[PDB]
Amino acid sequence: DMYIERAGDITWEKDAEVTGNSPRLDVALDESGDFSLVE
Amino acid sequence: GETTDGVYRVMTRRLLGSTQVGVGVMQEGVFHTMWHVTKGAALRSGEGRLDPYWGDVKQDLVSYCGPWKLDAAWDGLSEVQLLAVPPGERAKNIQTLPGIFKTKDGDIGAVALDYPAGTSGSPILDKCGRVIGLYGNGVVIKNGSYVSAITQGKRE
Numbered sequence: 001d002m003y004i005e006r007a008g009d010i011t012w013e014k015d016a017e018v019t020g021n022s023p024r025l026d027v028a029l030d031e032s033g034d035f036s037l038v039e
Numbered sequence: 040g041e042t043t044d045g046v047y048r049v050m051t052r053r054l055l056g057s058t059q060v061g062v063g064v065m066q067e068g069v070f071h072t073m074w075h076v077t078k079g080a081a082l083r084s085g086e087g088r089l090d091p092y093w094g095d096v097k098q099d100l101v102s103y104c105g106p107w108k109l110d111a112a113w114d115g116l117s118e119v120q121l122l123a124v125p126p127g128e129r130a131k132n133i134q135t136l137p138g139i140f141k142t143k144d145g146d147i148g149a150v151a152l153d154y155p156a157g158t159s160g161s162p163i164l165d166k167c168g169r170v171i172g173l174y175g176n177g178v179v180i181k182n183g184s185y186v187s188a189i190t191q192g193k194r195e
């Protein structure tokens with residue numbers, strides 16, 4: 001059986017670490033809700 | 040039990056010890072998570088019980104205690120924050136500029152951040168603190184890195 005535990009408030013933080021790129025990807029979404037790369 | 044708004048961990052005692060299978064968002068008395076995290080199962084909140092109210096495997100979303108409440112959307116221009124809640128670690132905000140998933144049914148924002156699978160369900164926020172989607176349904180690229188859709192539901 002699963003349970004929930006509070007982890008924090010939903011707020012934007014001014015001193016957050018900034019990282020990650022912004023790729024443009026062609027993808028397909030199947031009936032099981034899974035994404036796959038299409039090239 | 041705990042109905043206060045905020046970000047929550049989703050835990051199980053089925054596997055070894057206590058394991059974090061995912062994350063969710065409590066807002067307006069409704070718990071919002073990704074379908075692959077709970078597979079539609081009931082949740083416990085202290086001594087209280089959360090029952091699924093709505094869900095869709097193709098959207099990979101599920102709501103508890105009421106209908107989907109999160110209606111904000113990425114503007115397609117500005118940076119956002121992943122409020123990452125990794126297993127056994129403190130909630131941490133990470134700022135990024137989303138990329139794009141181009142599909143035959145239209146375009147969706149995507150965040151290129153690598154976190155363990157138990158981070159699925161962590162909310163993605165706009166500059167006003169509104170939840171524009173959940174992190175955790177996406178694709179693995181070239182070296183094993185992860186890129187997640189910004190997955191959002193519809194508020195009726």
Ligand SMILES: Cn1cc(NC(=O)c2ccccc2C(F)(F)F)cn1
Pocket residue numbers: 034075153154155156157158159174175176177185
């Ligand atoms: C169908 N499904 C989709 C997921 N999604 C993840 O597992 C997942 C979610 C967030 C970060 C990393 C990951 C992954 F690398 F792939 F491990 C799990 N099950």
